[PDB]
């Protein structure tokens, strides 16, 4: 476990913690971006210093009872069973009862709360209760908060005890190259894998600055990069020919495996056989849905209703796509449905079951939160080429009828 | 006019008096064929023009004599599926207790009646698509009850767009056989001349209508509605959005998460307590500010 | 006694104490119904098992490889299969039931499936999940799932099947993925999604920051039309099941299937209703079972059943043939009638079996021909030849003229398929064609060889593809009540209101309509609807009341009060809405 | 040595008792008079200590209660009941807490009571009692305000000497109370507005850093106090204190700044300097949203410039992904920055994740993830400043944003 490019943050945190018997800030609010070592540096630092601490994830604790019982039980394993508290007032009393053990009575007990922003959507008394816990309990306790959101949004309307907000600044390009090039594969040189990370960050940095995603793409594409050296095509020294090979393959990888249209395992299994590009369709380009006949006509009538202004109905059957769909009543859907289909249609119960069945899937959406049964309002939620493919299937020309 | 006068002034004599009697005498033939198809797994819906109440009440007195049956009147304004499930629980199974949620009460009433298949029950719903029993939740509850092997259901629908309630999964659950019975009996029982422009309401907006529908609500729901009243009374000097209201409930210690608030709001929408005047959405109460201030005693 | 301020009442028999009565030889007609229907249900579920095995093999291979990846490791990206079921929601459940068995044989004992309706929030989801895992072998948390898994294996993966993917809430799904990704070393979790429409629903329902935690591989289920073709090759186009369907009823069922909704289960509901209506009426349907035992039942009849035989139309046209001697013998003597019905029932059964064996060979001919002028499936070929003489039409002439141009290279394979289908069922009464196909097959100038086998297939299709109405006693095993069946399955309630207001004469037949209908029309509603019809989205209560009163009288208190009733009744049925009024929905 | 660290960490981290008041002497004389009247004589009083957050309320009530409880006559008799509005959010929890605080868990044998009034009357029956209702403005949000009604009603001379001391932050607490409890309320209030000019604030700064007279080593103490005297009378320190005075005026923010200055005195560096206070002021005064836009990659910066160009035409009508992408495609045509729609969509989601863009619908379901009406949460000047401090903005993107 190594901490690189984070000397200043570790210095500030270690100095704020102080000696063991001394007090510290009632709460600290660490914030930053998606992969800035918020969890890594805090867990590594607290573990190496050997301070007692309780690491709690808020996304797992979706109830007051679970969060409070989890904190209490992880503190009770550190003393020298299954205490249950259902209110925060019980938690303050039980926390004053647990920390009186001789291991924890002098030191500073830390409670780290990862993913603190979900704590915003729990009970109202919880977050100012944790910000003031050292005052409420009088027990030398510090409560860290690790989050991605700025402190401005966290403030309750009345106000609260202010935490010392600490910022973990992002890795720049040199910092990213120092992080990624540390755990080089031992078979090849360190300089070889450093040049590989240089050609990766040349083409992927403008899109992505996330450390995890860049590391995963540096793991996937590496065997393809050292393909010329194993087949005697080019030596280890000549970086230019290797970069000329790896640039088109990485530009292909940006479009497909980066967006996860091609899965990682399938991408490896294609790349070992030299068959990666254009062989798999991916999760997209499968926009083909096998529909019944009147479902096709109801769906293209709903699309043709929802992207036309109501004034033009007589001009066609008998402000653009940019704004989006516009809701329409049931009556206009039925009028366009009868006009658009050549066959005579009776209004059987199965047609109304079809209209609510497309709503049951995500091909339509009911907007009217009023009385739904007398004049429902509907809105079409499918893209243009899906409707153009369906209209190709039933041989109706949807382009001529659209106003735009 | 007056409602009492109209109920007294119905001394009319319909023109076709014998042919209507002949018409209603033809649907009494089919009852045995309805008793067979209920036993084989099908369920029956009745659609027509008149009032099917008299026909189903002839059915109950003719056929269902030795069997347990529950008669549900959809037309009564104070009804929900909570009342129906409480009725079956307390007065048939006789548990007479308390359940945390209606979904778990459904699971209890479903894991009994499956243990003992000898027990049998009929449902007779006089109007299935009244304003209280519409909705995805209520039809889902009724459909899950109806799809068992021991509970048989026969219903009647009146509205023009009634089959819009059920989709392909709900139609699988109910398993309907559609039988047309077009009587011509007037809806003397079904309709009540309330919210009618032509006739006086004996008080258009009395506070008793608000008080009675707030007696059924849970006390925390009464608090979530009471806060909306207090916010309504100070904009009389010239709509509340969901976000601001969710904040105001959150520091008032009444909701945990926004889903509880939203599900609570659907109950007010069904009871017609709230109407959302969408502009960006907003919440408003139809009861007028003077009468609303006359509610706080 | 049924009307009170109480919402609903409970009537029990207090201090008080079968199905065949409602059917009311009704007893033996009901036993035959139960026998035939349970055989059809068992054969449908056996077919359902055998149909989807091919994709179950690939799915079991994918789970074994993924859990082998976990056996390597103990980072991991939650192995997932995006199983693309169809839009046919009604028959998804059986597939999942089959899948729940198949995995449980091979991959793991621990398989659970979650419906979306049971889990509104993240508490109910985990409560249902832990209940179903504890079932198959008090405030439950995620740690409890891992503690249970560690205790019970003091090895196999835990797999969850999300049944309907569209109707989960977004937040529950993202929270479950985020929580489960952290604990993969303790809890080996495999997700299977029941996607109903398209894979893009994943991108609609999960953002890029959560779906990157999933490794998803697409799978399929077999399309609806081949499942319908398989259940029609087995349940109808066979002679093992005696009950059959008239062509028009088949058109009704395959127009509910092909237009409104793909669902095999609805088609099976239609066959059940056809069977029940055929056994409820037609008391001669006592003679519709396995041909051997039908002959046993023929002897133990009554005089009235022999009268029903004599009154039957096809048997009447049979006794019209040879009117001189056997006619009076059949009409007078019941024993000669009994034996003659045994002979005619035997001729009907052999007609059925010869008809289907010839039909399969005609389909093997038309399959090669790509134009497919008579239909690509077996069922639509059966439907097009079942009502109409196939040879008499121009249609067969067109397929014959296109057939002559075929060379031997495809045609030898065609006779290979024909010899195969003749070999597949033995005991046919078609030995001459069975050995003529053999001589035409495996030959060692081609044109004279081809012309004779084409005229041969013309001889077969003319000989044995006659329609079933031209047989004696076809009525005993054929059901033609297509209109009543259609009005039970698809009933349009808003077309049976438009013909009960505008045209009241249809139900009340007392000269109440001429075309202005009449003043003394059906009570109070039809005047209101007719005067309501004339507006353009604009009705005033006072003016509509005056237009009502100027025709009903041709005191005013009861007239205006009847108008109150009419307006409230059309408000109850939903024709008009409050807002003077100024709304007409039916425009 | 390190005793300076212990003492000043107990001064700043937690609010430990410190010797001198700062300009609230009249309020302390009033409140000490009320509490001594309640403690010695049979009088019942209600007060409301209204003030800003972090302006001395809890400190003043603890100091007054300590100074009162030094008397031997009062100490054997008086009982203190601390209630906090955050902890107790119901009538059941509050009444159970009062029972536990009075140590009456064996006088009551779990006998159910008809009303809260009778239960509270019996507990008070079975010796003056002092209540301290911290977070008073949360007690107003009860469904029926039984706790305040019963406490105020009993304080209307029920022959039990009770002082109900409310501590609230809201400056309109009186307009939240319902008519009943407002009418029972004895209208006596103590304000604690933190009113002092800048020289008094500098005197507070130079006194808090000073050590107490009691210290085991005095020669280090007098040198440190002389150093503090030097730091108080220095221009750049006074610039930092003048910059922090214009915002807060309360001693909690000054305590946080003093701690961040105090933290970086090592064994090698045993004396404070002005550079320490300047860098502590730099740590306190960082702008959050500028740091967030500092973090963002180039593609998301081009999206934010496109949203600003939409707001400078449509004038705060909301937008969706299609209009932003259309404007961005107007930029990229007339080659290096050419990307397809899913990459731009992956960039656009991460702005919503950081809360820089918020949807204006609060959707129950889903609305196609495009065509969804949204709002930027930055001003134009915030965007221009953030682009000014961006590390290496490409020249064409900057020229597009400026023009
Ligand atoms: N300074 C660093 N030195 C070495 N490795 C690092 C550093 N920062 C991050 N990493 C690596 O990045 C991975 C993810 O980092 P981490 O999860 O701590 O980021 P995070 O910001 O906490 O993420 P989240 O915000 O999602 O909690 C870690 O496994 C760690 O190995
Ligand atoms: N007028 C003052 N005189 C002396 N010290 C003060 C004054 N105002 C604030 N302080 C100091 O500032 C700190 C403020 O913390 P304190 O506990 O007083 O907050 P509070 O306002 O009482 O509580 P809350 O902010 O939660 O309502 C204390 O250390 C106190 O010593
Ligand atoms: Mg985090
Ligand atoms: Mg305080």
Author numbering:
A (entry chain E): 6 to 85, 92 to 329, 348 to 433
B (entry chain B): 268 to 505, 510 to 550, 554 to 571
C (entry chain C): 3 to 19, 25 to 31, 39 to 88, 97 to 159, 177 to 193, 212 to 501, 547 to 617, 620 to 658, ...
D (entry chain D): 17 to 142, 152 to 359, 363 to 431
What does the paper say about this structure?
The very first step of this initiation process is accomplished by DNA association with the Origin Recognition Complex (ORC), a six-subunit protein that forms a partial ring around origin DNA. The complex consists of six subunits (ORC1-6), with subunits ORC1-5 forming a partial ring capable of encircling DNA. All five subunits contain a winged-helix domain (WHD) and a AAA+ domain which consists of the RecA-fold and lid domains, although the ORC2 and ORC3 RecA-folds have diverged slightly and do not contain a lid domain. Adjacent ORC subunits associate in a double-layer arrangement through interfaces between the WHDs in one layer and the AAA+ domains in another with ATP-binding sites sandwiched between the ORC1·4, ORC4·5, and ORC5·3 AAA+ interfaces.
One construct consisted of full-length ORC1, but after expression and purification, ORC1 was absent yielding a complex of ORC2-5 (henceforth labelled ORCO2-5). The ORC2 WHD is significantly deeper in the core and rotated ~135° compared to the auto-inhibited state of ORC2 WHD in the DmORC structure. These observations along with previous studies on the dynamic, ATP-dependent assembly of ORC suggest a model in which a pre-assembled ORC2-5 complex binds to ORC1 and promotes the opening of the ORC core to facilitate DNA binding.
